[PDB]
From a paper:
To corroborate this further, we sought to replace wildtype RhlR with an in-silico optimized variant that triggers pyocyanin production independently of PqsE and C4-HSL. Indeed, the PROSS-designed RhlR-P75, in which 75 (out of 241) residues were mutated with respect to the original sequence, could easily be produced in E. coli, even in the absence of C4-HSL or mBTL. The variant displayed a melting temperature of 84.3 ± 1.3 °C in the absence of ligands, which increased to over 90 °C in buffer containing 1 mM mBTL, nearly 40 K higher than the WT protein under similar conditions. It crystallized readily in the presence of C4-HSL or mBTL, but not without these ligands. A complex with mBTL diffracted to 2.15 Å resolution and yielded well-resolved electron density for the ligand. The butanol-m-bromophenol group of mBTL resides in the hydrophobic acyl-binding tunnel leading towards the lactone binding site, and the m-bromophenol establishes π-stacking interactions with Y64 and Y72, two residues also contained in wildtype RhlR. Co-expression of RhlR-P75 and His6-tagged PqsE revealed that the interaction between both proteins has been lost by the introduced mutations.
Numbering used by the authors:
A (entry chain A), B (entry chain B): 6 to 241
The structure:
Amino acid sequence: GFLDWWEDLRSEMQSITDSQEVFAVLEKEVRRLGFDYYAYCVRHPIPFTRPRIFMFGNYPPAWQEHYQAQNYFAIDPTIRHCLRSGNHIVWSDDLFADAQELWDDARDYGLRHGATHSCMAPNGVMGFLSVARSSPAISPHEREELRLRMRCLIELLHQTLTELNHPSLQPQPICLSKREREILRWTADGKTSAEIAKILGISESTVNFHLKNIQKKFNAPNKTQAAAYAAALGLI
Amino acid sequence: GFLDWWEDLRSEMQSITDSQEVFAVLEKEVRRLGFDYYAYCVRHPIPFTRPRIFMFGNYPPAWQEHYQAQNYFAIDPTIRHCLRSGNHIVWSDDLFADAQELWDDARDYGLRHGATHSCMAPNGVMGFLSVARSSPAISPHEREELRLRMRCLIELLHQTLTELNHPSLQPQPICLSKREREILRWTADGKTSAEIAKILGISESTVNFHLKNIQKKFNAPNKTQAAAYAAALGLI
Ligand SMILES: O=C(CCCOc1cccc(Br)c1)N[C@H]1CCSC1=O
Ligand SMILES: O=C(CCCOc1cccc(Br)c1)N[C@H]1CCSC1=O
């Protein structure tokens, strides 16, 4: 049954040593779900205007090249940084209402039925797992089991790739002290250096010294970027 | 049959129309897992220094009031906003190495074995589900199934309470324009008002006009808070 399937896949993936074999197992499991193609996307939260995005999968190469040529990542709703009930969305005309050209084109490449499941690690990194096929529409009776299996797949995928330290997952490596973490929290809450100095019982000079060190660790021009980047990375 | 249990529980929860009944079902499912008590905690990401937290559960009231009196929420490792390797942690002496008074007290109240699962909505809200009991240690053979069941429980719990519009899951609404949003995004990436005026081809007066409005929407005294709040809420 389901638990048998899950335990066998855990064992199969726990025995992996190279990232290449992870996606090979994934490809097999996606076909077992009844789909021809899958994609995996890692969206880091920063920079806010041009977020680091890593993309993987086995879509027909002709579709990859077209998706890239048309810059569809910038409008694709399936990888939007947004809230979806159940972290799951079955593809539909409504879903692409504001991305009509992408949906028009994708169906012309045979990607006519599918779903995307998403997860978000507490470090701002979001994963998206898509499955797609040309013909059978997704049946209502298979929808909920598909969501459950996809959730299991994307969780095991993300965990396995993190444990092999795949470059895609390693987020901006920042290390903040307890003191400067606390100063940045008050800063992100809108306090000035003077207020923070009174709150912590230290000199305004010491606060600014810490803010300067924080800004350098973020390579930021000002405290606004540092506080926003720390929030998005889950550091405060 | 794991799948029938899930489908049975979904139907049960979907028939719920009062939040009280949701926790009643949850309490029964936690006993079915073999535990005496549960807690459910909703952690909003802001204010960074004093986050909006809602707590539910059926821990003995004597423990509830002791936990609150001691402010253990602030140091509790099970509800820390951090990256749990599987969104799941079984309680251990190691986990509480930095919170020894909490763990000593908890065991003195009979909370000696348990686990916490976590989920993060992509709007910064984090859910935590704990189960606890006094006697049998969690055995190696039941761990992976407990993880899976707890993940299903917290996901269904969060979904059901969301669709009932429970006030704990409702975040304070910020209605940001398409223009306000891109100005705040650039600002979070460290750009100045003068710079932003060049990117959008408008006056620096007009940028600060939007920023003063954005700041009002966040009830924020500066743009640093507006940007960090927008980031943590998933709004930019
Ligand atoms: O599955 C996704 C998420 C984006 C990742 O897809 C891609 C696109 C190009 C190369 C690679 Br590899 C993966 N988007 C869907 C929406 C409908 S058609 C499509 O590609
Ligand atoms: O489960 C958690 C985190 C959530 C605590 O939730 C609580 C605490 C007090 C009253 C209520 Br209601 C819920 N902490 C554990 C650590 C070991 S004992 C304990 O409470």
